[PDB]
Every structure is written in C-alpha cells, then in structure tokens.
C-alpha cells in the first residue's frame, strides 16, 4: 500500500557501509548501485551508504552493519524511511577527533597506523557528526566528524591534505558504545541464537502490545552449555541489540 | 641499527663474576676474554666482570648471575648499555665491612674461614659499593667495599697486606637481598619453570603495555603436585626475578 520499502536487518558479509538490497525488484527505487543513497534515522538522523545485490537476501529486508545502526540509533527489525537520490558532491580533507573514553591507542602518527588503507580506493561516504570503526594493531577505535566543509555529505578520494588533532573528548552517554558486544561479536553461526531471537521479539521489543492482547509471552528461558561456550555473550547481546536493561545476577 | 647488543640472562654456569658472551659475534665488541669489562646499571651503577665463551650460549643474550644483576639492580629479561674497554689497574689490600642483619658466621679470623680461597688466583675484580657473596661452612654472608684506595675499580692479588674490621651495619632496605629466593635456588631442571616465565613476563614486567593494547592476560594460575616439589618456590622466585609484590594468603 505505497509503503517505503525499508527492514533493518543484520548483515553478515563484512563491510564499513556497504548494503544489500533486494533484487526480486530493483526497479522500484532503480539504483544502479555504488550510488549514494539516504537512510532515514530518528530523533532527526540521517545515513549514507553504498549499495550492493545479493541472490541470498530477502525480497523482505536490508543488510546493514552496526556502525550504520548505532549512527541512525535504528534497531534490528526496525523500520527507517529510505529514498534514492543518486546524486553526491566531493569533499574536502574531512576533519576528525577521537570520540569517548578510548583513545591512547595511536602515538604519533595516527592516520598512518589508521586512515590511509580504509579511504583508499573506497570511495567510503562520510558524514558530519557520525562514528565509524578502523581496526588494525590489536586494538578498535572510533574517530568522531565534528566539521566537514561541504555538506550535508562527502564523497573521499586522495587528492585531498591530511589534517591531524588526536585529542580525546567525552562522547554523549546516551549513545550505544560499539565495544558492547552484540549479534556480530557472537561467533559460531550455530542458527541456534536465532531461536532466542524469535522468543524475545516480541516482549522486550514491543513492550505495549501485549497489554492490549491476552498471550503468554515467555518468563523465563534457561541456556545451558559447559562453561565458555557463549552463555553471557547471548544475554549480554540480546539485551544490548533490543535495547533492554541487562541485570546481572 | 646501531644497537648496543646487552641483554640479561639467567646463567647457569657457576660463577662469581665470570660472563658469557656470544661467539656468532666476536668481532663487534672484540674482547679476547679475561679483559676487565664495564657494565652499565640503572640510577648511575656500574659493574665490571670477566668474560669467557660459550658455544651453547645465544647470538642473543648474556649469561650473568644473581651478584651482579642484583649490584646493577638490573634484573632478568632487561637490557643494561655496556661497552668494552680493555683496561684495569691493580689495587691494594681492599676493605671489607659486614652487610645487613647477616653476621655473627665467623668469631676470630674471618678472612681465613672466608677470603683465602677466593681471592686466590682468581683476579676477581671487586668494586667499591657493591655487595658480593663467599660461601663455606655451611653458611652464606656477604662483605661490602665501603672504601678501596684505587678506583673506579681494582683487580686484586696476593701481593698486599690483610685489613680486618668485622663490624655488621644496616644494609639499605631499597635494595633486594641476596637469600631472598630466585632462580638459582630453584633446582630440578625441570624447565617447566620456564614455562611460567612466558606467561609472567610481559604482564608483570611490562605494565603500561597492556592498557595500551587489547590482549588478556591470565588471571589465575594453579601450580600443582605432590607437597614438597616446590610450589612456593616458584611463587617466591618469580615474584622476587621479577620485582613484583608477593602476598600469601
Ligand atoms: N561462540 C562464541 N563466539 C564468540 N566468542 C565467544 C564464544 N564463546 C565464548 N566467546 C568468548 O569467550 C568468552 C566466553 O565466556 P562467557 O561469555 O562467560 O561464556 P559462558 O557464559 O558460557 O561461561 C566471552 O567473553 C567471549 O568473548
Ligand atoms: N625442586 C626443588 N629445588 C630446590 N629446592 C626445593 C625443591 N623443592 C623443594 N625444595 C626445598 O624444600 C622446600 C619445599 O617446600 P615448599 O616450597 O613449601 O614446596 P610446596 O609449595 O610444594 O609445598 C623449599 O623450602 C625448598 O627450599
């Protein structure tokens, strides 16, 4: 009925901002694809990432990775308003900070031991006010964008000067830290955690809909395994990736 | 590049400052043996030793034992600048004090139960300052050089004549003394032992690192066996070659 078309899902191909997209139609936005394209958060939020075809996603929902989440602050299973628009425009030698508590990591030099081998070749979009994660030397940080010169968005290639800062600033405690563990730090590919993922749906998720119908939703639910076998990551991720309090009993 | 090329090693070998250094390369440093030599301590301290050779020695590291490191306060694993230089120059009659709470070992003659044999056609080169170990008689006692007429340093003969004092005084407490448990009196051979050293040597030789690089070290490690086979030992000498604080619960 004229919906938009857009399903938040986990994405399993490893990727900084790269998406798939269903093609039983491509017709219907018609992107081409490596086009830039918006992504609609909450709270006024918006995403730009690339687009790639997969035979094995669903007509139904979307590949996307954490760091696209975490920006929009969308959650698996949630719903964000998406338009095409082809177009992008350059920018210039995009400006950088270190974003909460994590830091130290880089001493010197940090966009040697960092930048240079993820913008190269990419073509990666990058955003005004985003976090995004560069791994490499045993260690994962996040490198905040206060200030861009073009807007809203810049597409990045190397013709552009190095700008350096490197010094740390507390990041909003509102915000989900990417160091939590969720549905990718869990291994294994057992398929069994998407059986928790169909029990905790529905209650923690959509917590009104179950006081105006009557149902059972499920109190209690036992993992057994011997020990370090994943027990505390499965609560730790469920509870972090539907955005539940965890306790800890 | 450049690199002096002194390490610290265990030495098994039996020795009152003797060193081996390696024969892959003879030639950078160049000493013929026998060659009174310069160490280089921490906190302005020098030491001087003698050198010989060993085929089963590495291209590594230095064979040197438990009175020099603890002279230098260098310990296992460290690195102490040293540079050949082939002089020395005789001394004279050098004196002789008790050191710490250890006395009362000798009554009358105390360089009859004690120096004769050493001194003797050793060419021992002693210090002024530093702390040195003679054993006989079914016990163990050090003699520090408060004052030697020559310096910086003395190599020693049975030309000259004999001082006597015997007089025991306070030892400083900063330094580390030499019944306090360590490699050496740790016997068996087991090379077990040597598997403990891998897991402590960078978390409790090398603090800062681990705040600056995702890793985990081990918590917990369970020495077992039959009672007698060592166990505090083990405890005792890692946490005394190391420098870090033993507790015992
Ligand atoms: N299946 C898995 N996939 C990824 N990481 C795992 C897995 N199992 C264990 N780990 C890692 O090892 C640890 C497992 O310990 P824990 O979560 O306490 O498991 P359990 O609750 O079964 O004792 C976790 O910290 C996690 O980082
Ligand atoms: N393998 C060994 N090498 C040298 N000395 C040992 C050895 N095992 C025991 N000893 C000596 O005997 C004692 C062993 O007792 P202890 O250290 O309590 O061992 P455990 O912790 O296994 O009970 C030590 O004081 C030590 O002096």
Chains 1, 2 share one sequence.
Request: proline share 7%; glycine share 8%.
């Amino acid at each position: 009925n004229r919906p938009n078309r857009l399903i938040v899902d986990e994405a399993i191909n490893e990727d900084n901002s790269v998406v798939s997209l269903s093609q039983p139609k491509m017709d219907e936005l018609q992107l081409f694809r490596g086009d830039t394209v918006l992504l609609k958060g909450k709270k006024r939020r918006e995403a730009v990432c690339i687009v790639l075809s997969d035979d094995t996603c669903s007509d139904e929902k979307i590949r996307m990775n954490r760091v696209v989440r975490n920006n929009l602050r969308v959650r698996l299973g949630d719903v964000i308003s998406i338009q095409p628009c082809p177009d992008v425009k350059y920018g210039k030698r995009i400006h950088v900070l270190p974003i909460d508590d994590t830091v130290e990591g880089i001493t010197g030099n940090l966009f040697e031991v960092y930048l240079k081998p993820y913008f190269l070749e990419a073509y990666r979009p990058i955003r005004k006010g985003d976090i995004f994660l560069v791994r490499g030397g045993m260690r994962a940080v996040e490198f905040k964008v206060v200030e861009t010169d073009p807007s809203p968005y810049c597409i990045v290639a190397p013709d552009t000067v190095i700008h350096c800062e490197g010094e740390p600033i507390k990041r909003e405690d509102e915000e989900e830290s990417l160091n939590e563990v969720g549905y990718d730090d869990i291994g294994g590919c057992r398929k069994q955690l998407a059986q928790i993922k169909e029990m905790v749906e529905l209650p923690l998720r959509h917590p009104a809909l179950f006081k105006a119908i009557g149902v059972k939703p499920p109190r209690g639910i036992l993992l057994y395994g011997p020990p370090g076998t994943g027990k505390t990551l499965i609560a730790r991720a469920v509870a972090n990736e539907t955005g539940a309090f965890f306790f800890l009993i």
